Amino acid sequence: DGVGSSSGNWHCDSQWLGDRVITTSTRTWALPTYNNHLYKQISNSTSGGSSNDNAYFGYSTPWGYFDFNRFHCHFSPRDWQRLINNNWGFRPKRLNFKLFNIQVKEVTDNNGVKTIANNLTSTVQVFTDSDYQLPYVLGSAHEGCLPPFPADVFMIPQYGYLTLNDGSQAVGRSSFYCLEYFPSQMLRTGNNFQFSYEFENVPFHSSYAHSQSLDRLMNPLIDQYLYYLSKTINGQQTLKFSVAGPSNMAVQGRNYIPGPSYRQQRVSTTVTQAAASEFAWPGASSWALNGRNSLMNPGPAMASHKEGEDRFFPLSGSLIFGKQGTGRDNVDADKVMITNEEEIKTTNPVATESYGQVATNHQSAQAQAQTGWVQNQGILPGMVWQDRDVYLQGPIWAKIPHTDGNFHPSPLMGGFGMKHPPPQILIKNTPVPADPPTAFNKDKLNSFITQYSTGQVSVEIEWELQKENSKRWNPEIQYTSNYYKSNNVEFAVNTEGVYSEPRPIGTRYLTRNL
Amino acid sequence: DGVGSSSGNWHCDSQWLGDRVITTSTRTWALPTYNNHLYKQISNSTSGGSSNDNAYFGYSTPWGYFDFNRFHCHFSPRDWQRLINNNWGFRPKRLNFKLFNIQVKEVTDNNGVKTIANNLTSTVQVFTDSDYQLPYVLGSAHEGCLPPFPADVFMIPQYGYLTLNDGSQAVGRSSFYCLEYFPSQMLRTGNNFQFSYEFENVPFHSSYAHSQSLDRLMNPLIDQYLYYLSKTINGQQTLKFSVAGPSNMAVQGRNYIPGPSYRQQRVSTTVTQAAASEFAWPGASSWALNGRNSLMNPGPAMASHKEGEDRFFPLSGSLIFGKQGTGRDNVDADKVMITNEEEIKTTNPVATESYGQVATNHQSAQAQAQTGWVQNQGILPGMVWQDRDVYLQGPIWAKIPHTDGNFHPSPLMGGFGMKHPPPQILIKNTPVPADPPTAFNKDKLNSFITQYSTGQVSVEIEWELQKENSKRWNPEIQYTSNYYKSNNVEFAVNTEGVYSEPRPIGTRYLTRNL
Amino acid sequence: DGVGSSSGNWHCDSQWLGDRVITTSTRTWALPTYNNHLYKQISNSTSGGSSNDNAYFGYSTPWGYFDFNRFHCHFSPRDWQRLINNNWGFRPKRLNFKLFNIQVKEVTDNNGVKTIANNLTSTVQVFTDSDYQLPYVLGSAHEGCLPPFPADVFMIPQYGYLTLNDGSQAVGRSSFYCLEYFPSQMLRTGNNFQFSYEFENVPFHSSYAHSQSLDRLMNPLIDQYLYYLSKTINGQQTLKFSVAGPSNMAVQGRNYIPGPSYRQQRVSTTVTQAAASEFAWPGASSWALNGRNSLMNPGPAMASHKEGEDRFFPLSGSLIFGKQGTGRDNVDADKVMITNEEEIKTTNPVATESYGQVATNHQSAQAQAQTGWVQNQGILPGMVWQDRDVYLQGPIWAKIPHTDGNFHPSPLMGGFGMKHPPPQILIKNTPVPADPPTAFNKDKLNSFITQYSTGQVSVEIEWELQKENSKRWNPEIQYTSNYYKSNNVEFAVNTEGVYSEPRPIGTRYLTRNL
């Protein structure tokens, strides 16, 4: 429109209908100039790294991008509490995104002092990768998302991507992408940008915990009409059979079995434990691709620990969040928040235990029957399992890789897997050259006016709800704040205005039968 | 129609529309009399074999069959080059088949000299197994398909099938099929045969190579909001956590993991390597069925070798084609063409490497953390993979076995899996008895006129194309002939008129993101 | 239709309308099996040649082809005489082609004796290269055309083509063409083939000789109003000028100049001339392409000899025809017929003379004026010329090479140049395999029934005529037979039934002004 007219209003609210909840969040963003308007080839050689498992090749772009792939970007703690305490499931339906109130500033430095002024004629470029023609980086748990607290002003992360690499070198199959080779809208201070997106059909997330275990689905009062091998010896091959009943539930015939497993090493959170060695990488569970070892993290959805063993967690089978103010490198256990998936112990195997035992020979009068531990078990017919729970500060969705085949493409870090997820939204400040020389020079200009941009961003997502119809008589487990006095209110600001999330919040508090 | 009128024309051409390509191929065939018009029980006893893994029971029929289940039967090398260099995928849509210009000949031998003359009144019988009531032998990479060179005249292979066997003996469940118990059209020299077939819906074949690896999908500039266990000891269980970022990509959380594996033994193509033993069968990867060991060949789609290790190939995990003129038994490595699947190293594990490592115990102050190699890994949720590539001389389709359950029924040798593939087309010369005795004899006649038949066969297949919409800036890898001078043109005839295919041609040259 | 019904009639006649003449010719042809149904790579190595100017690479096909690119294939000598004596020009308009009365024979040899019998069920394949996708070999003066005498039975020439070569080797850019990769009609004894072709617009051939010379177009009674430099010296630079008039026609100003030239060495037909050396190749005029020297033959259209010098002919600037019964190698001059282009001496320069003289320095008081002979002269503005005359036994048309640029694409051997000439008509006997073995063998069949085919071919061409409207008073020169007695009639059969053409007949007997 014009310089003196706002191009949008501040929309931040949650609307709770019967089977739907609509979340709207608005944030103020700041966008600097990245790479000084240049594309730069990057690799482990340019970052000084030399281990082959950490080798890479790719490019850093002068473009930024908008990321809102975390639940706390849309749900307040109270809204999250309502969702998890009142619904058996939820899933995103549609998306509305807006950019408005664009403000481009120029920075001039004379001597140790910088002056900031408006550049009303400068432009900012925005486009969406609706055709998914660029590498998708929103499927990784990267920082730079919209802040959970609406009052926080955030910096737009720089967009970068990786391609095929051989050590620090590239190959002929490696691809180079120029983001200026895409049509993009150019916005001055009076312009705004908006688009709508429809989520593809995805299953409802399981925001419930099973009230029954897979091995306890039988009637505890009635025998089965099936027999099991009880005895074998007299005290001669004396085969004896008995009815499987309530007194021996472990040997009863069952129609379904627990889901797959990929065993994790076990770590205790108890201080004054002596470790026998440094094992964080040597003892790690891991998968190899083209000679590169990657850590299995978080791996298949498995129960974090057995009943009563909350002190143990899988070495890399659980999401680890950092508390507010936590450092980047080598922080203590009390500075991080270790999530656990104990709710899925009713259907999924324990992460730090073998799946089971399998016969490994033919027993005879000369050879005793032998069994072997199954540390990793693939998918078998009749298996049932629960996917990893999602969290308030955890990811929402991920892009299913474009491959010939996949099985249960639920993101392993939690969330909804989609072939066509919300498109990447890329933003960049248009370069503004400084005064050029009065004589023609064919070289590209390298002198630009120092600029940055700021504005507001709004994203609205409609969520579909799956209401609970339980006939359970006794009250359910519910997420609740603790009344006991404390120096600060949980999920609030401190005396210095710092917002903090004191604990990870799952979704599985209500119960339903298996 | 009549003796002196052709029943069809020679159609051999390729028509390239926008999203579709129509291939038409015509060949001249010759059909002899098989088994002297008899059905014969066959087994490993009748072929003199005595190893139980090679034991069989079945029947050889006097019928021949038409096979066009190889890509070079329909695509010329130039058409194949266009398809692979300009399309991200393709799949068959519909089929047209024709038999015409039937010519039945009689052969008479007087003394060391044979005379060939037309038998205008004799008939040839043709029918299609549209109901799939006969054993399907087109799903195996058998010889006898239409020649890649249109000028070559080919011999129709004899139809045979196998049933249940116990050693060299049959069981009560074994089935015997009489092909004369089917309605078939009888054609004289003036008649022709034709039918149309519609391919069932199949996914597009992946004629692309990924430009990204599964372990390099993150933004190389932004840290994750997740932590990993870095340290453990002081130099006391001192648990330390760090942010997973660009400097350590191997430990970053990931949503998807590489596909399944079934490890192959590794063989070097380098001459003057000393082998430690004869291992081609003892070292083989293998699966057992009812006490019979079958070689795992080609097995699950896995990367043939790591980067830079082209000299290595899996022992039986790759398709091996023979060069023109190559012998049948014990030929050298230079007489065969070893295909490789290096393009799928971005998503599939290396065939000659373990899938990864899994924890095998509980670490403590007394026991060091232990890990074990995963040589075989089944399907797990979140896995993605690419199927085996198809080749110009490789198979096109296969029949999915009629079973209660299957997973990703893409043929392991490459191609399109279908419950209802193109039906088997069976052809046989009608027996023409010689002069019978003037006195009645109840025994079946065993004196027949020596006959064979010849004619033309045409098959037209419409293929749907998936065009590429890449935004890649740098040029792609393309299949191209080499300009450098040579004695012969590749994919052409020699000075003796022998057509040869000098190398296997895949389909994965273009690139797309993962 | 049927075995016992003719598929066409014998049409051979000429119809003379006002401005059009329609020629129809029918011939009986015989087609053997070429290369034993095989494609064969050929080169100068396979023919034993080692000079680099004669090096080649290409392929010989089992296909034959129909050629009627000679005027005597359509015009009888009397029709040719009428055309040349009554018309100032002519050009082809449209074409009708027919194949009918197909007869396929099988040949069996027992011991030194061959038996020929009909094979009523065998087929012959015919198609036209209407899209010009195959190398065009009809643009060369090759043998194998329809005989000039309608009663002669001719053998169909074998089709072959050449591609890019480096010595006896090929390069990556070399192309291999399979003629079975084209749709073709298959004809039994009852079938026939026909198609129509429309000639693209071409200029009328000049069937006239100019009655004026380019240097004698002025009025012989009137002076010009232009002056020329007559004198220079006194006997001091004394410049003198004079009027150019009838007394000095050589110095008169002229608006147009004779056409281009490329000088030929001069050869006398007079016996008992002593040559100073062997010069037939060393003295030859020639052009080089990629290091290969090709003879300039027949080169640009130039006058064969000056007035009264009929004994001289250019070394390779004239078409040389062989008399009936003339051998292939090293025949005497009386065994060949040397054509001459003396009719174009009025506009074209003499082939064995320089185009003219050009100044080569600046004359002064110290340096005498110098001139140099112009042995080769390119196109200049104001040039006019006549193209090479066509002959009764000479070629009719040629295909203009598909190139970015060309100038006056009239074929240098004479005729009409067309981007889309009459398409090549290719014919082949369908291979008929002998008795195949009773056991399947994957190799292509190499045992075939010995066969050949015969039939009639008819071609009808409509020619447009350009009538003469001369006001010349005295009678014109006309082609006429000589009344004087001779042992045989010219253009007739001998006592042994051998038809002969005793002399080449041009088209330029009538006259018109320049």
Short mmCIF file of N, CA, C and O in Angstrom, two decimals, chain A residues 53 55 133 139 141-143 162-163 173-174 176-177 181 263 265-266 268 272-274 286 288 290 292 294-295 297 320 327-328 330-332 352-353 376 379 402-404 407 412-413, chain B residues 206 208 210-212 215-216 219 222-225 227 230 236-237 240-243 248 250 254-255 307 342 345 355-358 362-363 365 377 379 382 386-387 469 471 473-474 512-513:
data_model
loop_
_atom_site.label_atom_id
_atom_site.label_comp_id
_atom_site.label_asym_id
_atom_site.label_seq_id
_atom_site.Cartn_x
_atom_site.Cartn_y
_atom_site.Cartn_z
N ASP A 53 33.35 -39.81 8.81
CA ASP A 53 31.94 -39.82 9.24
C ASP A 53 31.33 -38.41 9.30
O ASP A 53 30.11 -38.26 9.17
N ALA A 55 32.53 -35.84 7.17
CA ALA A 55 32.81 -35.17 5.91
C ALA A 55 31.53 -34.75 5.15
O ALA A 55 30.52 -35.45 5.18
N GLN A 133 11.44 -28.21 -5.10
CA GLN A 133 12.57 -28.33 -6.00
C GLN A 133 13.91 -28.06 -5.32
O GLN A 133 14.95 -28.26 -5.94
N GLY A 139 13.03 -30.69 7.88
CA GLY A 139 12.87 -32.00 8.46
C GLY A 139 13.88 -32.37 9.51
O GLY A 139 13.83 -33.48 10.05
N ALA A 141 15.75 -31.17 13.25
CA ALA A 141 15.44 -30.38 14.44
C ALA A 141 16.42 -29.22 14.59
O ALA A 141 17.21 -29.20 15.54
N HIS A 142 16.38 -28.27 13.67
CA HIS A 142 17.27 -27.13 13.68
C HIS A 142 16.70 -26.00 14.53
O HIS A 142 15.48 -25.86 14.68
N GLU A 143 17.60 -25.19 15.09
CA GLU A 143 17.19 -23.97 15.76
C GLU A 143 16.71 -22.94 14.73
O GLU A 143 16.76 -23.16 13.52
N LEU A 162 23.11 -29.40 1.65
CA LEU A 162 24.21 -30.32 1.39
C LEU A 162 23.88 -31.18 0.18
O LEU A 162 22.71 -31.47 -0.10
N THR A 163 24.93 -31.58 -0.54
CA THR A 163 24.78 -32.47 -1.69
C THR A 163 25.74 -33.65 -1.56
O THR A 163 26.36 -33.83 -0.50
N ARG A 173 27.62 -35.98 -9.85
CA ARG A 173 26.19 -36.04 -9.53
C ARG A 173 25.76 -34.96 -8.54
O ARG A 173 24.55 -34.76 -8.37
N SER A 174 26.70 -34.26 -7.91
CA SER A 174 26.35 -33.20 -6.98
C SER A 174 25.61 -32.08 -7.70
O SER A 174 25.90 -31.76 -8.85
N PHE A 176 24.04 -28.05 -7.68
CA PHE A 176 24.15 -26.68 -7.19
C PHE A 176 22.87 -25.94 -7.52
O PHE A 176 22.44 -25.93 -8.68
N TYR A 177 22.26 -25.32 -6.51
CA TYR A 177 20.98 -24.65 -6.66
C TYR A 177 21.16 -23.15 -6.44
O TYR A 177 21.74 -22.73 -5.43
N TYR A 181 17.13 -18.29 -9.27
CA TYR A 181 16.54 -18.93 -10.43
C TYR A 181 15.09 -19.34 -10.19
O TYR A 181 14.54 -20.15 -10.94
N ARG A 263 18.54 -52.45 19.60
CA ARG A 263 18.94 -52.26 20.99
C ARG A 263 19.91 -51.10 21.15
O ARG A 263 20.82 -50.90 20.34
N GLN A 265 22.50 -49.12 24.07
CA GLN A 265 23.25 -49.22 25.32
C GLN A 265 22.55 -48.39 26.42
O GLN A 265 21.88 -47.40 26.13
N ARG A 266 22.66 -48.82 27.67
CA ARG A 266 21.97 -48.25 28.83
C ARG A 266 22.88 -47.32 29.61
O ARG A 266 24.02 -47.67 29.91
N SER A 268 22.97 -44.74 33.12
CA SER A 268 22.35 -44.29 34.37
C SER A 268 22.56 -42.79 34.56
O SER A 268 23.66 -42.29 34.39
N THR A 272 27.94 -40.45 40.89
CA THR A 272 28.85 -41.38 41.61
C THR A 272 28.85 -42.83 41.10
O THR A 272 29.54 -43.69 41.66
N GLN A 273 28.17 -43.09 39.98
CA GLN A 273 28.41 -44.26 39.14
C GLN A 273 29.81 -44.16 38.50
O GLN A 273 30.12 -43.16 37.85
N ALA A 274 30.62 -45.21 38.62
CA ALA A 274 31.87 -45.35 37.89
C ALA A 274 31.66 -46.07 36.54
O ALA A 274 31.26 -47.24 36.50
N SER A 286 24.29 -47.83 15.77
CA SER A 286 24.70 -47.02 14.63
C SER A 286 24.33 -47.66 13.27
O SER A 286 24.17 -48.88 13.21
N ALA A 288 25.35 -47.61 8.90
CA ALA A 288 26.39 -47.20 7.96
C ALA A 288 25.79 -46.96 6.58
O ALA A 288 24.93 -47.72 6.12
N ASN A 290 27.35 -45.83 2.74
CA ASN A 290 28.46 -45.50 1.85
C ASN A 290 29.76 -45.29 2.63
O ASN A 290 30.54 -44.37 2.36
N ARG A 292 30.10 -44.30 5.70
CA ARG A 292 29.97 -43.34 6.78
C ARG A 292 29.04 -43.89 7.85
O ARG A 292 27.94 -44.37 7.55
N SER A 294 26.76 -43.21 10.91
CA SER A 294 25.84 -42.29 11.57
C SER A 294 25.25 -42.94 12.83
O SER A 294 24.93 -44.13 12.83
N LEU A 295 25.16 -42.19 13.92
CA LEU A 295 24.57 -42.61 15.19
C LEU A 295 23.08 -42.97 14.99
O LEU A 295 22.37 -42.22 14.33
N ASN A 297 19.83 -42.34 16.01
CA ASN A 297 19.29 -41.34 16.92
C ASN A 297 18.10 -40.64 16.28
O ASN A 297 18.25 -39.98 15.24
N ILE A 320 16.67 -35.23 23.53
CA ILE A 320 17.28 -34.48 24.62
C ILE A 320 17.12 -33.00 24.33
O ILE A 320 17.68 -32.50 23.34
N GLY A 327 24.45 -24.22 27.91
CA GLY A 327 25.52 -24.03 26.95
C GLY A 327 25.44 -25.02 25.80
O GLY A 327 24.60 -25.91 25.74
N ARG A 328 26.37 -24.83 24.86
CA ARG A 328 26.34 -25.62 23.63
C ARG A 328 27.14 -26.92 23.76
O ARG A 328 26.75 -27.95 23.20
N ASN A 330 29.31 -29.80 26.13
CA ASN A 330 29.70 -30.48 27.36
C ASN A 330 29.04 -29.86 28.59
O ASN A 330 29.70 -29.31 29.48
N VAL A 331 27.72 -29.96 28.63
CA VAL A 331 26.94 -29.50 29.77
C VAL A 331 26.59 -30.70 30.63
O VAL A 331 26.56 -31.85 30.18
N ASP A 332 26.31 -30.44 31.91
CA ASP A 332 25.97 -31.50 32.84
C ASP A 332 24.55 -32.00 32.59
O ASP A 332 23.76 -31.40 31.85
N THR A 352 16.65 -50.73 25.86
CA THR A 352 17.91 -51.24 26.39
C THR A 352 17.86 -52.73 26.69
O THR A 352 18.68 -53.23 27.48
N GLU A 353 16.92 -53.45 26.09
CA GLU A 353 16.78 -54.89 26.30
C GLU A 353 16.64 -55.59 24.96
O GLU A 353 16.21 -55.00 23.97
N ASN A 376 18.46 -57.11 17.61
CA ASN A 376 17.73 -56.33 16.62
C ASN A 376 16.73 -57.25 15.94
O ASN A 376 17.08 -58.35 15.51
N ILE A 379 10.64 -56.07 11.12
CA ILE A 379 9.19 -56.18 11.10
C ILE A 379 8.77 -57.61 10.80
O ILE A 379 9.31 -58.27 9.91
N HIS A 402 11.89 -38.79 -1.06
CA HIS A 402 11.36 -39.27 -2.33
C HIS A 402 12.14 -40.51 -2.75
O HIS A 402 13.18 -40.41 -3.41
N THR A 403 11.64 -41.68 -2.37
CA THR A 403 12.31 -42.95 -2.66
C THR A 403 11.29 -43.92 -3.23
O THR A 403 10.07 -43.70 -3.16
N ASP A 404 11.80 -45.02 -3.79
CA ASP A 404 10.92 -46.04 -4.36
C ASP A 404 10.07 -46.70 -3.28
O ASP A 404 8.89 -46.99 -3.51
N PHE A 407 8.62 -47.78 4.69
CA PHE A 407 7.72 -48.49 5.59
C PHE A 407 7.39 -47.61 6.78
O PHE A 407 8.30 -47.16 7.48
N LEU A 412 11.05 -40.42 12.76
CA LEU A 412 11.58 -41.09 13.94
C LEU A 412 11.77 -40.14 15.12
O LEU A 412 11.74 -40.59 16.27
N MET A 413 11.94 -38.85 14.86
CA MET A 413 12.01 -37.87 15.94
C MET A 413 10.63 -37.46 16.44
O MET A 413 10.54 -36.67 17.39
N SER B 206 12.25 -45.70 -10.93
CA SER B 206 13.14 -44.59 -10.56
C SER B 206 14.31 -44.57 -11.53
O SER B 206 15.30 -45.28 -11.37
N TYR B 208 16.30 -42.07 -11.88
CA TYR B 208 17.09 -40.96 -11.38
C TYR B 208 18.03 -41.45 -10.29
O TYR B 208 17.82 -42.49 -9.67
N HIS B 210 19.80 -40.03 -6.69
CA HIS B 210 19.63 -38.98 -5.69
C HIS B 210 20.88 -38.10 -5.63
O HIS B 210 22.01 -38.58 -5.62
N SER B 211 20.65 -36.79 -5.59
CA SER B 211 21.73 -35.81 -5.45
C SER B 211 22.03 -35.49 -4.00
O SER B 211 22.89 -34.64 -3.73
N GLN B 212 21.35 -36.14 -3.06
CA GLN B 212 21.61 -35.99 -1.64
C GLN B 212 21.67 -37.36 -0.99
O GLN B 212 21.05 -38.31 -1.46
N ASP B 215 22.10 -39.24 5.13
CA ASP B 215 22.75 -38.72 6.32
C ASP B 215 23.20 -37.27 6.19
O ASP B 215 23.87 -36.76 7.08
N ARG B 216 22.85 -36.60 5.09
CA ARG B 216 23.25 -35.22 4.84
C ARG B 216 22.05 -34.40 4.36
O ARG B 216 22.12 -33.65 3.39
N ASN B 219 20.51 -28.79 7.51
CA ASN B 219 21.10 -27.50 7.15
C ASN B 219 22.53 -27.45 7.68
O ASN B 219 22.73 -27.56 8.90
N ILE B 222 23.13 -24.47 10.67
CA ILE B 222 22.32 -24.25 11.86
C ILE B 222 22.42 -25.46 12.78
O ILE B 222 22.34 -26.60 12.32
N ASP B 223 22.59 -25.20 14.07
CA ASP B 223 22.58 -26.27 15.06
C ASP B 223 21.18 -26.83 15.24
O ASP B 223 20.17 -26.18 14.96
N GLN B 224 21.12 -28.08 15.71
CA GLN B 224 19.86 -28.66 16.15
C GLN B 224 19.53 -28.18 17.56
O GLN B 224 20.40 -27.76 18.33
N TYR B 225 18.24 -28.24 17.91
CA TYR B 225 17.81 -27.98 19.27
C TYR B 225 17.80 -29.24 20.13
O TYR B 225 17.14 -29.26 21.18
N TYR B 227 20.19 -32.48 22.01
CA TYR B 227 21.48 -32.77 22.61
C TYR B 227 21.80 -34.25 22.49
O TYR B 227 20.91 -35.10 22.40
N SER B 230 27.90 -36.71 24.86
CA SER B 230 29.26 -36.54 24.35
C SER B 230 30.27 -37.32 25.19
O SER B 230 30.85 -38.30 24.72
N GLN B 236 34.38 -42.15 37.83
CA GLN B 236 33.20 -41.34 38.06
C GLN B 236 32.39 -41.16 36.77
O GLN B 236 32.94 -40.81 35.73
N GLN B 237 31.09 -41.42 36.86
CA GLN B 237 30.21 -41.29 35.70
C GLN B 237 29.84 -39.83 35.44
O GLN B 237 28.78 -39.37 35.85
N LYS B 240 28.15 -35.88 30.11
CA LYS B 240 28.25 -34.58 29.46
C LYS B 240 27.45 -34.61 28.16
O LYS B 240 27.47 -35.61 27.44
N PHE B 241 26.75 -33.52 27.88
CA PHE B 241 25.91 -33.41 26.70
C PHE B 241 26.30 -32.19 25.89
O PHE B 241 26.76 -31.18 26.44
N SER B 242 26.13 -32.28 24.57
CA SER B 242 26.52 -31.22 23.66
C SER B 242 25.47 -31.08 22.56
O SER B 242 24.72 -32.02 22.28
N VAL B 243 25.43 -29.90 21.96
CA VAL B 243 24.51 -29.64 20.86
C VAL B 243 25.02 -30.33 19.60
O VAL B 243 26.20 -30.22 19.25
N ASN B 248 29.55 -31.87 13.96
CA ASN B 248 29.36 -33.30 14.20
C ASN B 248 28.02 -33.71 13.60
O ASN B 248 27.00 -33.75 14.29
N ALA B 250 27.38 -36.69 12.29
CA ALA B 250 27.11 -38.11 12.48
C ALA B 250 26.18 -38.37 13.65
O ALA B 250 25.46 -39.38 13.66
N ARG B 254 17.93 -37.87 13.31
CA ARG B 254 17.41 -38.02 11.96
C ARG B 254 16.07 -38.74 12.00
O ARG B 254 15.83 -39.58 12.87
N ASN B 255 15.20 -38.38 11.06
CA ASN B 255 13.85 -38.93 11.02
C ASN B 255 13.75 -40.22 10.23
O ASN B 255 12.81 -40.99 10.45
N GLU B 307 32.19 -45.73 -2.08
CA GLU B 307 32.76 -44.75 -3.00
C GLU B 307 34.23 -45.08 -3.28
O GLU B 307 35.02 -45.30 -2.36
N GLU B 342 25.65 -48.48 -7.71
CA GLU B 342 26.27 -47.45 -6.89
C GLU B 342 25.38 -46.22 -6.73
O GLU B 342 25.56 -45.44 -5.79
N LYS B 345 23.56 -45.75 -3.32
CA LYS B 345 24.34 -45.66 -2.09
C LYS B 345 23.88 -44.53 -1.18
O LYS B 345 24.28 -44.50 -0.01
N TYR B 355 24.97 -53.54 8.20
CA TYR B 355 24.02 -52.43 8.28
C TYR B 355 24.45 -51.42 9.33
O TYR B 355 24.31 -50.21 9.13
N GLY B 356 24.97 -51.89 10.46
CA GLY B 356 25.39 -51.00 11.52
C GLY B 356 25.80 -51.79 12.75
O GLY B 356 26.12 -52.98 12.66
N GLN B 357 25.79 -51.11 13.89
CA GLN B 357 26.15 -51.72 15.16
C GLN B 357 25.01 -51.52 16.16
O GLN B 357 24.36 -50.47 16.17
N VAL B 358 24.79 -52.53 16.99
CA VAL B 358 23.74 -52.50 18.00
C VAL B 358 24.33 -52.93 19.33
O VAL B 358 25.21 -53.80 19.40
N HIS B 362 24.58 -54.47 28.94
CA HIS B 362 24.38 -53.30 29.79
C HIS B 362 25.73 -52.90 30.37
O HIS B 362 26.32 -53.64 31.16
N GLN B 363 26.22 -51.72 29.98
CA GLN B 363 27.49 -51.24 30.48
C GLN B 363 27.39 -50.92 31.97
O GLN B 363 26.34 -50.53 32.48
N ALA B 365 30.25 -50.32 35.77
CA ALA B 365 31.61 -50.10 36.26
C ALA B 365 32.48 -51.34 36.09
O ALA B 365 33.71 -51.22 36.08
N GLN B 377 19.47 -56.96 8.39
CA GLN B 377 18.53 -56.08 9.07
C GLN B 377 17.21 -56.07 8.31
O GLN B 377 17.18 -55.76 7.12
N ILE B 379 13.00 -54.94 7.81
CA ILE B 379 12.32 -53.66 7.66
C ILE B 379 12.02 -53.06 9.03
O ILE B 379 11.55 -53.75 9.95
N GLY B 382 10.30 -46.00 9.39
CA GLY B 382 11.17 -44.91 9.02
C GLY B 382 12.21 -45.24 7.98
O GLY B 382 12.96 -44.34 7.57
N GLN B 386 15.78 -47.44 -2.32
CA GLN B 386 15.55 -47.44 -3.76
C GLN B 386 15.61 -48.87 -4.29
O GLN B 386 16.45 -49.66 -3.85
N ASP B 387 14.73 -49.18 -5.22
CA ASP B 387 14.71 -50.51 -5.81
C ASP B 387 15.84 -50.65 -6.83
O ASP B 387 16.46 -49.68 -7.26
N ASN B 469 11.46 -31.90 -13.64
CA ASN B 469 11.23 -30.48 -13.38
C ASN B 469 12.29 -29.93 -12.42
O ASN B 469 11.98 -29.14 -11.52
N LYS B 471 15.35 -27.89 -10.72
CA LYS B 471 15.90 -26.53 -10.70
C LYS B 471 17.41 -26.53 -10.60
O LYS B 471 18.00 -25.47 -10.32
N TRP B 473 21.19 -26.14 -11.33
CA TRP B 473 21.84 -25.15 -12.18
C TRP B 473 22.90 -25.79 -13.08
O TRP B 473 22.91 -25.56 -14.29
N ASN B 474 23.79 -26.59 -12.50
CA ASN B 474 24.86 -27.21 -13.26
C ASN B 474 24.32 -28.35 -14.12
O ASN B 474 23.30 -28.96 -13.80
N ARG B 512 17.68 -35.84 -8.63
CA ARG B 512 16.66 -35.11 -7.90
C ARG B 512 16.97 -35.19 -6.42
O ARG B 512 17.71 -36.07 -5.96
N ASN B 513 16.41 -34.26 -5.66
CA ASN B 513 16.68 -34.19 -4.23
C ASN B 513 16.04 -35.37 -3.51
O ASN B 513 15.12 -36.03 -4.01
#
